[PDB]
Amino acid sequence: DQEKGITIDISRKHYTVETLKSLVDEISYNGGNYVQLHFSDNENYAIASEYLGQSSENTNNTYLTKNELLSLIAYSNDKDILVIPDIDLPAHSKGWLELIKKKDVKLYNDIVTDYSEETLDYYDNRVALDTVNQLLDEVLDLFYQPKFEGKQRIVLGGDEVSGSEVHQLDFIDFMNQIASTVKESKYEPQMWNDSITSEGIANLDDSFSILYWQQSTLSSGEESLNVEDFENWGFSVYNYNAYSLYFLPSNGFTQEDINEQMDYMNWAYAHNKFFYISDYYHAVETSNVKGSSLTFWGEHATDLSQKKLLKQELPLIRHYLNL
Ligand SMILES: CC1=N[C@@H]2[C@@H](O)[C@H](O)[C@@H](CO)O[C@@H]2S1
Numbered sequence: 362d363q364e365k366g367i368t369i370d371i372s373r374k375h376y377t378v379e380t381l382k383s384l385v386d387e388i389s390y391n392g393g394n395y396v397q398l399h400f401s402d403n404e405n406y407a408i409a410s411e412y413l414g415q416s417s418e419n420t421n422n423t424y425l426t427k428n429e430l431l432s433l434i435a436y437s438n439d440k441d442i443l444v445i446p447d448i449d450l451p452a453h454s455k456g457w458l459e460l461i462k463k464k465d466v467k468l469y470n471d472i473v474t475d476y477s478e479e480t481l482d483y484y485d486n487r488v489a490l491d492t493v494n495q496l497l498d499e500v501l502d503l504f505y506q507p508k509f510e511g512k513q514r515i516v517l518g519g520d521e522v523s524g525s526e527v528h529q530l531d532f533i534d535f536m537n538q539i540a541s542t543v544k545e546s547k548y549e550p551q552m553w554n555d556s557i558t559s560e561g562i563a564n565l566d567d568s569f570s571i572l573y574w575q576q577s578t579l580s581s582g583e584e585s586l587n588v589e590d591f592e593n594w595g596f597s598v599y600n601y602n603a604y605s606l607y608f609l610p611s612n613g614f615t616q617e618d619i620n621e622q623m624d625y626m627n628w629a630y631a632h633n634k635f636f637y638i639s640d641y642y643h644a645v646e647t648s649n650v651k652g653s654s655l656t657f658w659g660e661h662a663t664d665l666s667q668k669k670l671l672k673q674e675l676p677l678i679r680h681y682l683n684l
Contacts, residue, residue: 364652
């Protein structure tokens, strides 16, 4: 059994709870297993947080209200859909850091890297970890789903982490700490593949499953880890193929563009065809593949209405889930 999931960037692009409910409808209709809610990135933190000071119980253009989010999860669970929270650490973090800035400038200066406003100081900084751990406790609580007790998961990010190649062991140790927090609440931790190196893989908690989206190149020009490599060190992977399984909804796109996307997916997509440097659709023969996901990234969706978002996403969801 392979899982199939949809991942929705609700950070770079605002989504009503109704749009998300209709998306989950389509996921359930076609026998999908999960939806991944990428709600924290540089542009915005798009759910409600006591801890960060997003409390309004009223609908708004910034974040899902607590009850909105909780309604969405209850809805998804009723359709046998697991909701997987996705909070991006330690980079892609400007959104909630700006919230910490406004809440407590002193704490902000104690946890932000000296060089990036998007990156939390993962370089062995205790107060950075403590802040994150509190934010994670709130998030683990919000996404509690008793129907999926003992199968819940959370994406902790780990993608595009500046400094992580050179300072690999600090990256890994940080990822292990936040892994530890979430295992405390019985979730399985997950992260993107891209910032983990040969140096780091031996120290990484193998409780992590990996979201394999694109094989990285080291600064030497050498090839970074592939799925076999991850298999060799005990890591399960999921195919998030950056070509076949990524799509950026855009105002410019018509019906014919969506038709072309579906014709492309017909040949480009398979459950086990990952994006390797050499072959963008590389068939892999390992035993560590657990599923796949189509992902809607939000950063081209600037001028899309809720309706036009549905019009683009709904058919791609259906096509992917039936391939
Ligand atoms: C994981 C990934 N991190 C990036 C996202 O943050 C961007 O939205 C998009 C690039 O345009 O895809 C890559 S994949």
